[PDB]
Amino acid sequence: AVAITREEFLQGLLQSSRDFVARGKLKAPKWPILKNLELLQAQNYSRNIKTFPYKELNKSMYYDKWVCMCRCEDGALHFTQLKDSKTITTITTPNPRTGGEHPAIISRGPCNRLLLLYPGNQITILDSKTNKVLREIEVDSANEIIYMYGHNEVNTEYFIWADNRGTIGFQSYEDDSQYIVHSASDVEYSSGVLHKDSLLLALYSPDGILDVYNLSSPDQASSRFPVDAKIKEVKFADNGYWMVVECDQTVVCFDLRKDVGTLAYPTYTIPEFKTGTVTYDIDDSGKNMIAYSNESNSLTIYKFDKKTKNWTKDEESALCLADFTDMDVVCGDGGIAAILKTNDSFNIVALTP
């Protein structure tokens, strides 16, 4: 390929990681007071298709976050992507599979690469810009892959995959070349998330399991983090040292600089779960949160205050608006947007001062 031994590949990973470890260290801009909302568009989507948000270092040394929804009809995949209010686009690309079968996971890679996982651990890579098939790949593992991601800056010849028992490997985009860095039982994972510097990978499941693996030192024991509680997402915050565990009604934030288990601040209870269909999401800085109440059709904004170490509601943000069960948030410099989702459709809401 280009890397002939795992030893050569590991040193490419560490080196490329060192190239970027000191970049992307500036803060995203502070959120203004938000007072107006605009319903931008209502669309249907296929919720069973998991889509991992794509992160890109920007010229201002913080990261942009692209969120993606997929609607799969009749041998086409309709995508809606945005990193803020002014970058909404809808792209249609062909579904390479027979019969209109749905991917289980869709993720992006650099150079307009689109990664499509189909059950049985079969991966197709498309160029979303030219509509060509670049790769048809099979991963030999008896366990279902539950995570697939390609970093936009670090080690950009490979993307990462992980199965639901902790096998972790890297796969070259162009060559038939791959390396396993962790091998498979105790666990049963549903999802994953990759740290900014692409050396730490968290694997987790809804029932409390949270294991962080070190991708650059093969088969070193994963560290297990103590969560009581139903996990719904784990995020590595953009500052590089918070690991945020979004649960159903609690937020747990671990401090990666200290002993495994040490919190960055006291665990936070979402108010007011009733108890109940309130939903929420935290942005990738880990400092800004938006919550939705189906009861009052209102959005509430919370801000984390590192002086007091707790979340407090911003009372100057009365945002009132159809019953959503999940949501995601984006906030590039074109404006903050909330993506409100039912189990089969979604509404995008622009938020402005």
Side-chain angles (χ1 to χ4, degrees), residues 43-55:
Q43 287 204 44
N44 287 324
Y45 79 118
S46 314
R47 186 176 177 107
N48 53 310
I49 302 174
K50 262 140 182 168
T51 59
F52 287 89
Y54 193 70
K55 298 279 280 289

Side-chain angles (χ1 to χ4, degrees), residues 74-95:
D74 267 5
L77 304 151
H78 309 284
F79 290 113
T80 302
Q81 312 182 69
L82 77 156
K83 72 163 178 64
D84 60 36
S85 295
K86 264 50 170 179
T87 51
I88 314 180
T89 72
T90 290
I91 267 59
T92 286
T93 81
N95 178 357

Side-chain angles (χ1 to χ4, degrees), residues 237-254:
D238 282 340
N239 64 27
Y241 61 98
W242 282 354
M243 180 166 56
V244 184
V245 185
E246 293 185 4
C247 308
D248 265 339
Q249 27 180 344
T250 53
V251 185
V252 177
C253 182
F254 289 106

Side-chain angles (χ1 to χ4, degrees), residues 206 227-233 244-253 265-282 289 291-292 302 311 325-326:
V227 169
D228 161 58
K230 294 324 222 76
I231 306 195
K232 92 181 149 81
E233 204 187 339
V244 184
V245 185
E246 293 185 4
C247 308
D248 265 339
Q249 27 180 344
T250 53
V251 185
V252 177
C253 182
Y265 58 81
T267 296
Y268 181 53
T269 294
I270 302 281
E272 334 167 5
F273 252 63
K274 205 162 181 43
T275 83
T277 321
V278 153
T279 181
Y280 79 98
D281 194 37
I282 299 177
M289 176 204 291
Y292 181 75
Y302 301 82
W311 294 90
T325 63
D326 196 28

Side-chain angles (χ1 to χ4, degrees), residues 189-200:
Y189 304 121
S190 64
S191 179
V193 60
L194 181 78
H195 179 273
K196 164 202 173 331
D197 299 314
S198 172
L199 305 193
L200 305 172

